[PDB]
Amino acid sequence: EVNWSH
Amino acid sequence: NRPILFDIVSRGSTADLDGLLPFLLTHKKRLTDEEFREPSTGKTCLPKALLNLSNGRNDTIPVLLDIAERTGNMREFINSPFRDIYYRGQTALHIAIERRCKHYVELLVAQGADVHAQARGRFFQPKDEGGYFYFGELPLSLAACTNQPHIVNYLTENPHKKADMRRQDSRGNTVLHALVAIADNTRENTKFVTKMYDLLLLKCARLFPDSNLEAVLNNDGLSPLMMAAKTGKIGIFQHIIRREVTDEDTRHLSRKFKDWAYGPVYSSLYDLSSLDTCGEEASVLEILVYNSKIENRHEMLAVEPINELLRDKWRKFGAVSFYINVVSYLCAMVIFTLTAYYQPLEGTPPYPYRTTVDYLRLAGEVITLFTGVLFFFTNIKDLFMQLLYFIYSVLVIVSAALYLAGIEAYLAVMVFALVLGWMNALYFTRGLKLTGTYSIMIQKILFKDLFRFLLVYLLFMIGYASALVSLLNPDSETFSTFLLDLFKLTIGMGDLEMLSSTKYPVVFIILLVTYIILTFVLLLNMLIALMGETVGQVSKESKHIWKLQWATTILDIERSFPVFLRKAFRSGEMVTVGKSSDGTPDRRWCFRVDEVNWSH
Numbered sequence: 001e002v003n004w005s006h
Numbered sequence: 007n008r009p010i011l012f013d014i015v016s017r018g019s020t021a022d023l024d025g026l027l028p029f030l031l032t033h034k035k036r037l038t039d040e041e042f043r044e045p046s047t048g049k050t051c052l053p054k055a056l057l058n059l060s061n062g063r064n065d066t067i068p069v070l071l072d073i074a075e076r077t078g079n080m081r082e083f084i085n086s087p088f089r090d091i092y093y094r095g096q097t098a099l100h101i102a103i104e105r106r107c108k109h110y111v112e113l114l115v116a117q118g119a120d121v122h123a124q125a126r127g128r129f130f131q132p133k134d135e136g137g138y139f140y141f142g143e144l145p146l147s148l149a150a151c152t153n154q155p156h157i158v159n160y161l162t163e164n165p166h167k168k169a170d171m172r173r174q175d176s177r178g179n180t181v182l183h184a185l186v187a188i189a190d191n192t193r194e195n196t197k198f199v200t201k202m203y204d205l206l207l208l209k210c211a212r213l214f215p216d217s218n219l220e221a222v223l224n225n226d227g228l229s230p231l232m233m234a235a236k237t238g239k240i241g242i243f244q245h246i247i248r249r250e251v252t253d254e255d256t257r258h259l260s261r262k263f264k265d266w267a268y269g270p271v272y273s274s275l276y277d278l279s280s281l282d283t284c285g286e287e288a289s290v291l292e293i294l295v296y297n298s299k300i301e302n303r304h305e306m307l308a309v310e311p312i313n314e315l316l317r318d319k320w321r322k323f324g325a326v327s328f329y330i331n332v333v334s335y336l337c338a339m340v341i342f343t344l345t346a347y348y349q350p351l352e353g354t355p356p357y358p359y360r361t362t363v364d365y366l367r368l369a370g371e372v373i374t375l376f377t378g379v380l381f382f383f384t385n386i387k388d389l390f391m392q393l394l395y396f397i398y399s400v401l402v403i404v405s406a407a408l409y410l411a412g413i414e415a416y417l418a419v420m421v422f423a424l425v426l427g428w429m430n431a432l433y434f435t436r437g438l439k440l441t442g443t444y445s446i447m448i449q450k451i452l453f454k455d456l457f458r459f460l461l462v463y464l465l466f467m468i469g470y471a472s473a474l475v476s477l478l479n480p481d482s483e484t485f486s487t488f489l490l491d492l493f494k495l496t497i498g499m500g501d502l503e504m505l506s507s508t509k510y511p512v513v514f515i516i517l518l519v520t521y522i523i524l525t526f527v528l529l530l531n532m533l534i535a536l537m538g539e540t541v542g543q544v545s546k547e548s549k550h551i552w553k554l555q556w557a558t559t560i561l562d563i564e565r566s567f568p569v570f571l572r573k574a575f576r577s578g579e580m581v582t583v584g585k586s587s588d589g590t591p592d593r594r595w596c597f598r599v600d601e602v603n604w605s606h
C-alpha cells in the first residue's frame with residue numbers, strides 16, 4: 001500500500 | 007572474509023572493525039573486490055551499513071570512509087552502484103536520502119558522492135510498468151518527492167557539489183515532472199506537493215532568471231501542466247493554472263493577475279498562453295478533452311478560465327458554424343435522396359445523358375460524390391496524422407465506382423449509403439443542449455448494452471429455431487422458409503400452418519409458447535430495465551456528458567479551420583502585465599473573469 005501520513 | 011565483514015557491519019559494532027586497515031594494507035585488497043561484494047546484487051559495505059542502523063546513528067560510516075580513503079578507492083567505492091534487474095543504479099546516497107538522515111547525506115556529499123547518479127532499476131519504475139516507487143531517478147528528485155524540504159535546500163546549495171534543478175533523467179522527466187508523477191488527489195499529498203513545487207520553482211527562477219523551469223519537456227514532449235492534465239491530477243493542475251506570485255522579483259512567472267476592482271466586483275485576468283494554442287503547439291484543452299481514460303475528465307474542466315473560455319468561444323464562433331454544418335448536411339442528404347429516387351430504372355448502368363433532366367441527375371450525382379470524397383479525405387487525413395462517416399464515404403465511392411463499371415448491385419449499396427446518411431443525422435443533434443444529452447445517452451446505450459444483448463440473442467435464437475426445425479418431419483430450403491415464417495410470427499403477424507407434418511404437436515406448441523414467453527416477457531423486459539437504471543445512475547452525469555459533448559464539438563470545429571483563420575478568431579486580449587528583468591514588456595495573452603464577493 002501507499003501511505004503519505006506515516 | 008565477506009561473511010565476517012557483512013556480520014560486523016550488520017551488527018553495527020565498532021570494535022570488530024579494528025585490524026581491517028592493516029589487513030587490507032598487507033594483502034593490498036580493495037573494498038570493491040568481487041569477493042568482498044555480494045554476488046547477488048553488488049551491494050558494497052556502505053549501503054549495507056546504511057540499510058540497517060539505529061535511530062539514525064549507525065556510528066560505523068566514518069570508519070568505513072576513513073578506511074576507503076586509506077586504500078584510495080573512495081571514487082569507486084562511495085558511489086558503487088547495485089547490479090541486477092531489481093535495484094540497478096542505486097547508490098549509497100539514494101539510500102541515505104531514503105532513510106531521512108540529513109547528517110549522512112552531508113557526510114556523503116562532502117566526500118565526493120555522485121549527486122546525479124540515476125537509479126533506474128525495475129524497483130523504481132512507474133506503477134503501470136511493473137515497479138513500486140517512481141521518483142524521477144535522481145537524489146534531488148527523490149528528496150523532493152519524499153517531502154523533505156531541508157534535504158532539497160542543502161543539496162541544491164552546497165559548496166562541494168550542486169544538483170541543478172533543471173536536470174533530466176533517462177525518461178527526460180525533471181523534478182517537477184516527478185513531483186507531478188507522484189501526486190494523488192488526497193489532501194495530505196497535495197498539501198506538500200503544491201508547496202514543494204512552488205518552492206522549487208521560485209528557487210530555480212531565482213538562481214537562473216533567464217531560463218524557465220517549466221519550459222523543459224520530457225522525451226514524450228509534455229510539460230508539468232500538460233502531464234498533470236493527461237494523468238488526471240486535479241490537485242496540482244488547479245494550483246498551477248491559477249498560480250499568482252506576490253513577490254515582485256518573481257512576479258513574471260505568475261499566471262493569474264488582478265486587473266481592477268470596483269466595490270463588490272473584482273476582475274482578474276488569467277493567462278492561457280500554454281493553455282490554449284492555435285496549432286503552435288499542443289494545448290492543455292485538446293489533451294484533456296480528446297484523450298481517453300482520464301480519471302477526473304469531467305471535474306477537471308470545472309476551472310475558472312477553462313469553462314469561460316469554452317463559453318466565449320462558443321458564442322464568438324461555435325454556434326454559427328454548427329448550424330451551418332447541420333443545415334448543409336441535411337440539404338446534401340436531401341439531394342442524395344432525390345438523386346437515388348430519380349435513378350432511371352430502365353436500362354443498365356451507366357445511363358447515357360441527352361437531356362436537361364439527365365444533366366440535373368448528373369449534377370446531383372456529382373454533388374453526392376463530392377460529399378463522399380470530402381468525408382473520405384477528412385477521415386483518411388485523421389488516420390494518417392467518425393467511423394460511421396467513414397462507412398458512409400466509402401460506400402458512396404464504391405457505389406459510384408460500380409455505377410461506372412456497370413452492374414445493378416450498386417443501387418443496393420447506394421441505397422444503403424442513403425440509409426446510413428440519415429442514420430447518423432441524429433448524431434448532429436449532439437451540439438444542441440436539450441436533445442444532445444439524449445442523443446449522447448442513446449449512442450452510449452446503443453453501442454455498449456445493445457451489442458451485448460444482440461450477441462446474446464443471436465446464437466440463442468438461431469439454435470432454438472434450428473431445434474424446432476429439426477423437430478418437424480415431412481433440408482436447407484425447409485429451414486430457410488421456416489425461419490422467415492418463425493420471424494414473422496415473432497413480429498406478431500402470420501400463422502403457424504406448417505405444423506401439419508409434425509408428430510407430437512403438443513411439445514411443439516409448448517416450445518413455441520416458451521419461446522414467445524422468453525422473447526417478449528423476459529428478454530424484452532430486461533432491455534427496458536437496463537435503460538431506466540443507467541439514466542438514474544447517470545442522472546448527475548447528464549450535465550457532465552452534455553458538457554463534454556459540447557466541448558468536443560466546439561474543439562472539432564476549431565481544429566477544422568486552418569491556422570491563420572484560428573489566429574483571426576483567437577480569444578483573449580494582449581495585456582502588458584509587467585516588464586521582464588531586462589525591462590522589456592511582456593505582452594502576454596490573457597482572458598478576463600470577474601466575480602462578486604460581499605465578504606471581502
Ligand SMILES: CC(C)CCC[C@@H](C)[C@H]1CC[C@H]2[C@@H]3CC=C4C[C@@H](OC(=O)CCC(=O)O)CC[C@]4(C)[C@H]3CC[C@]12C
Pocket residue numbers: 460463464467486487489490491493
Ligand atoms: C433477433 C435478432 C438478434 C436476430 C435478427 C433476425 C434475423 C436473423 C431474421 C429476421 C428475418 C429473417 C429472414 C426472413 C427471410 C429470409 C429470406 C430467405 O431466403 C428466401 O428468400 C426464401 C424465403 C422468401 O423468399 O421469403 C433466407 C433467410 C431470410 C434472410 C431470413 C433469415 C433470418 C432473418 C433475417
